[PDB]
Design an enzyme around this catalytic site. Structure first.
Site, PDB file in Angstrom:
ATOM      1  N   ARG A 172       0.816  -1.231   0.000  1.00  0.00           N
ATOM      2  CA  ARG A 172       0.000   0.000   0.000  1.00  0.00           C
ATOM      3  C   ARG A 172       0.843   1.271   0.000  1.00  0.00           C
ATOM      4  NH1 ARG A 172      -3.833  -1.495   5.031  1.00  0.00           N
ATOM      5  NH2 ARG A 172      -1.779  -1.134   5.984  1.00  0.00           N
ATOM      6  N   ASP A 237      -0.136  -9.695   4.699  1.00  0.00           N
ATOM      7  CA  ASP A 237      -1.437  -9.306   4.135  1.00  0.00           C
ATOM      8  C   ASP A 237      -2.483 -10.405   4.070  1.00  0.00           C
ATOM      9  OD1 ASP A 237      -1.063  -6.555   1.753  1.00  0.00           O
ATOM     10  OD2 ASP A 237      -0.548  -6.732   3.903  1.00  0.00           O
ATOM     11  N   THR A 238      -2.066 -11.637   3.771  1.00  0.00           N
ATOM     12  CA  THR A 238      -2.997 -12.779   3.747  1.00  0.00           C
ATOM     13  C   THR A 238      -3.637 -13.036   5.113  1.00  0.00           C
ATOM     14  OG1 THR A 238      -1.106 -14.250   4.004  1.00  0.00           O
ATOM     15  CG2 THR A 238      -2.046 -14.047   1.778  1.00  0.00           C
ATOM     16  N   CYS A 343       1.351 -23.269  -0.272  1.00  0.00           N
ATOM     17  CA  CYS A 343       1.800 -22.362   0.810  1.00  0.00           C
ATOM     18  C   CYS A 343       2.659 -23.080   1.825  1.00  0.00           C
ATOM     19  CB  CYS A 343       0.605 -21.710   1.532  1.00  0.00           C
ATOM     20  SG  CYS A 343       1.082 -20.559   2.864  1.00  0.00           S
ATOM     21  N   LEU A 344       3.852 -22.553   2.079  1.00  0.00           N
ATOM     22  CA  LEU A 344       4.716 -23.107   3.129  1.00  0.00           C
ATOM     23  C   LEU A 344       4.283 -22.642   4.512  1.00  0.00           C
ATOM     24  CD1 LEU A 344       8.110 -22.546   1.279  1.00  0.00           C
ATOM     25  CD2 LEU A 344       7.362 -24.836   2.104  1.00  0.00           C
ATOM     26  N   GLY A 345       3.584 -21.514   4.569  1.00  0.00           N
ATOM     27  CA  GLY A 345       3.115 -21.007   5.855  1.00  0.00           C
ATOM     28  C   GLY A 345       1.784 -21.527   6.353  1.00  0.00           C
TER      29      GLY A 345
HETATM   30  C1  HEM Z   1      -4.400 -17.051   5.469  1.00  0.00           C
HETATM   31  C2  HEM Z   1      -3.067 -17.125   5.287  1.00  0.00           C
HETATM   32  C3  HEM Z   1      -2.379 -17.516   3.945  1.00  0.00           C
HETATM   33  C4  HEM Z   1      -2.890 -17.754   2.718  1.00  0.00           C
HETATM   34  C5  HEM Z   1      -4.343 -17.712   2.235  1.00  0.00           C
HETATM   35  C6  HEM Z   1      -1.778 -18.070   1.821  1.00  0.00           C
HETATM   36  C7  HEM Z   1      -1.839 -18.373   0.476  1.00  0.00           C
HETATM   37  C8  HEM Z   1      -0.769 -18.785  -0.301  1.00  0.00           C
HETATM   38  C9  HEM Z   1      -0.828 -19.264  -1.670  1.00  0.00           C
HETATM   39  C10 HEM Z   1      -2.113 -19.386  -2.528  1.00  0.00           C
HETATM   40  C11 HEM Z   1       0.424 -19.567  -2.053  1.00  0.00           C
HETATM   41  C12 HEM Z   1       0.912 -20.154  -3.410  1.00  0.00           C
HETATM   42  C13 HEM Z   1       0.740 -19.175  -4.557  1.00  0.00           C
HETATM   43  C14 HEM Z   1       1.307 -19.805  -5.814  1.00  0.00           C
HETATM   44  O1  HEM Z   1       1.138 -21.027  -6.072  1.00  0.00           O
HETATM   45  O2  HEM Z   1       1.934 -19.049  -6.587  1.00  0.00           O
HETATM   46  C15 HEM Z   1       1.305 -19.305  -0.937  1.00  0.00           C
HETATM   47  C16 HEM Z   1       2.665 -19.507  -0.959  1.00  0.00           C
HETATM   48  C17 HEM Z   1       3.602 -19.183   0.003  1.00  0.00           C
HETATM   49  N1  HEM Z   1       3.326 -18.738   1.284  1.00  0.00           N
HETATM   50 FE1  HEM Z   1       1.339 -18.407   1.936  1.00  0.00          FE
HETATM   51  N2  HEM Z   1      -0.624 -18.021   2.559  1.00  0.00           N
HETATM   52  C18 HEM Z   1      -0.937 -17.704   3.839  1.00  0.00           C
HETATM   53  C19 HEM Z   1      -0.039 -17.556   4.867  1.00  0.00           C
HETATM   54  C20 HEM Z   1       1.321 -17.640   4.834  1.00  0.00           C
HETATM   55  C21 HEM Z   1       2.175 -17.503   5.998  1.00  0.00           C
HETATM   56  C22 HEM Z   1       1.716 -17.254   7.467  1.00  0.00           C
HETATM   57  C23 HEM Z   1       3.435 -17.618   5.588  1.00  0.00           C
HETATM   58  C24 HEM Z   1       4.627 -17.530   6.561  1.00  0.00           C
HETATM   59  C25 HEM Z   1       5.757 -16.952   6.184  1.00  0.00           C
HETATM   60  C26 HEM Z   1       3.435 -17.850   4.154  1.00  0.00           C
HETATM   61  C27 HEM Z   1       4.529 -18.052   3.326  1.00  0.00           C
HETATM   62  C28 HEM Z   1       4.483 -18.508   2.030  1.00  0.00           C
HETATM   63  C29 HEM Z   1       5.639 -18.816   1.197  1.00  0.00           C
HETATM   64  C30 HEM Z   1       7.121 -18.705   1.623  1.00  0.00           C
HETATM   65  C31 HEM Z   1       5.054 -19.282  -0.151  1.00  0.00           C
HETATM   66  C32 HEM Z   1       5.825 -19.732  -1.425  1.00  0.00           C
HETATM   67  C33 HEM Z   1       5.671 -21.236  -1.674  1.00  0.00           C
HETATM   68  C34 HEM Z   1       6.642 -21.653  -2.752  1.00  0.00           C
HETATM   69  O3  HEM Z   1       6.755 -20.932  -3.790  1.00  0.00           O
HETATM   70  O4  HEM Z   1       7.318 -22.700  -2.565  1.00  0.00           O
HETATM   71  N3  HEM Z   1       2.122 -17.874   3.720  1.00  0.00           N
HETATM   72  N4  HEM Z   1       0.547 -18.842   0.126  1.00  0.00           N
END
Ligand code: HEM
Length: 400
Positions: A172, A237-238, A343-345
């Site tokens: 933002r 943000d998620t 998602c890793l998180g």
């Molecule tokens: C409600 C919470 C969350 C939602 C809805 C969400 C959603 C997503 C989605 C859809 C992707 C994959 C997108 C793609 O395929 O291009 C992703 C990837 C990722 N997320 Fe999340 N996420 C959330 C929370 C988090 C949290 C808490 C972390 C902690 C650091 C995190 C870290 C990551 C990382 C590092 C990736 C990359 C995975 C890869 O490319 O190997 N996410 N997330």
């Protein structure tokens, strides 16, 4: 406005959806996107908004294209046409970085953090409780995921305001910094810390990343800062916006609140159903070559939006998809993605959500939208809630 229609795209497939400002927005963002699932709309459509791009509208196509990384590449994952790792990487080089990041945010790390997560949530809630009101988005949701990152990464509390400012500018911008300046300032921050934690490590996420191996050799500084950066921004943000959608639903539906007050054992299942109904991410991919996909001729270099949000809203995947039912026997969704970039998180996020709901419902069981207030949503790659003014009578609450 509307980019000219490429020769290969037949006109019967044109549906001018704008992902940054969909036309049904004031009725709620998930509802605005679900117009793409009306019976007169094909499974795969072309929009001329935003440079022009495909949109897969149904769970079956969304999943399949995320599985088929050989045609649907992550090299350009955003509409319209940023160096964080492993976002932009396709398999097979993505596997190694993914394994390393998993060490820092995987299930055993999360089980270990669980009660630190609970205490942070309890102290934020306790501070709001006697006031009888808050903007949930600003007062609870924003301060929460950033503080969980400081815990995970072993960074001191005093660094939050500056770090939060930098990540705010990436999503933002107020105009003080371009995207690239905010990124570089973030890298300016992380590099000395990474360098120091190579020589003298701890058990924290930065120490572990910095001492990791890639291709049988040491991780470099460029690679480590780019991964640490993604671990920071991926969870802000998620989580901020997802907690807001959930609290908005619970504030508006006394009957669902009551269900969770009476049976708190249902809260982990309720979290799963909320993740389906209030899904919020819409990433994309780019075509590596000419490819016919479900009867549609796709051209090399075409972009395709594969909305993670829409799989769980598809009535072909879940019956009465807009109805929230905590007892669903099969909750089906791709809220955290699908395929090699899942998602890793996700495990950390689930725990942040569950803990939030358990702590809020215990201490402030009865709350409402502020009278006269109208909740505004926003749409994009991560859809969200502008603000969430909540009100409650303090006498009906409890200090723990
Ligand atoms: C409600 C919470 C969350 C939602 C809805 C969400 C959603 C997503 C989605 C859809 C992707 C994959 C997108 C793609 O395929 O291009 C992703 C990837 C990722 N997320 Fe999340 N996420 C959330 C929370 C988090 C949290 C808490 C972390 C902690 C650091 C995190 C870290 C990551 C990382 C590092 C990736 C990359 C995975 C890869 O490319 O190997 N996410 N997330």
């Amino acid at each position: 406005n509307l980019a000219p229609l490429p020769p290969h795209v037949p006109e019967h497939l044109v549906f001018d959806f704008d992902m940054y400002n969909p036309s049904n927005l004031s009725a709620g963002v998930q509802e605005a996107w679900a117009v793409l699932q009306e019976s007169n709309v094909p499974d795969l459509v072309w929009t001329r908004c935003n440079g022009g791009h495909w949109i897969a509208t149904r769970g079956q196509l969304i999943r399949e294209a995320y599985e088929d990384y050989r045609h649907f590449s992550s090299e350009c994952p955003f509409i319209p046409r940023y160096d964080f790792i492993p976002t932009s990487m396709d398999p097979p080089e993505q596997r190694q970085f993914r394994a390393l990041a998993n060490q820092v945010v995987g299930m055993p790390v999360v089980d270990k953090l669980e009660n630190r997560i609970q205490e942070l949530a309890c102290s934020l809630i306790e501070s709001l409780r006697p006031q009888g009101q808050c903007n949930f988005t600003e007062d609870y949701a924003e301060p929460f995921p950033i503080r969980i990152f400081m815990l995970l990464a072993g960074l001191p509390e005093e660094d939050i305001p500056h770090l939060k400012y930098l990540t705010d500018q990436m999503t933002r911008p107020d105009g003080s910094m371009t995207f690239a300046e905010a990124k570089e300032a973030l890298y300016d921050y992380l590099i000395p810390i990474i360098e120091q934690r190579r020589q003298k490590p701890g058990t924290d996420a930065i120490s572990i990343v910095a001492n990791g191996q890639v291709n049988g050799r040491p991780i470099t500084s460029d690679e480590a800062k780019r991964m640490c950066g993604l671990l920071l921004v991926g969870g802000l943000d998620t989580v901020v916006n997802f907690l807001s959608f959930s609290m908005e639903f619970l504030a508006k539906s006394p009957e669902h609140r009551q269900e969770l007050i009476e049976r708190p054992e249902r809260i982990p299942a309720a979290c799963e159903e909320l993740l389906r109904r209030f899904s919020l991410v819409a990433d994309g991919r780019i075509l590596t070559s000419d490819y016919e996909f479900h009867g549609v001729q796709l051209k090399k270099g075409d972009q395709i939006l594969l909305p993670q949000m829409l799989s769980g809203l598809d009535e072909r995947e879940n019956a009465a998809p807009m109805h929230v039912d905590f007892s669903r026997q099969k909750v089906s969704h791709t809220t955290f993605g699908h395929g090699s970039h899942l998602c890793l998180g996700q495990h950390l996020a689930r725990r942040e959500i569950i803990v939030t709901l358990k702590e809020w419902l215990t201490r402030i069981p009865d709350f409402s939208i502020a009278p006269g207030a109208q909740i505004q949503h926003k749409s994009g790659i991560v859809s969200g809630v502008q603000a969430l003014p909540l009100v409650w009578d303090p006498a009906t609450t409890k200090a723990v």
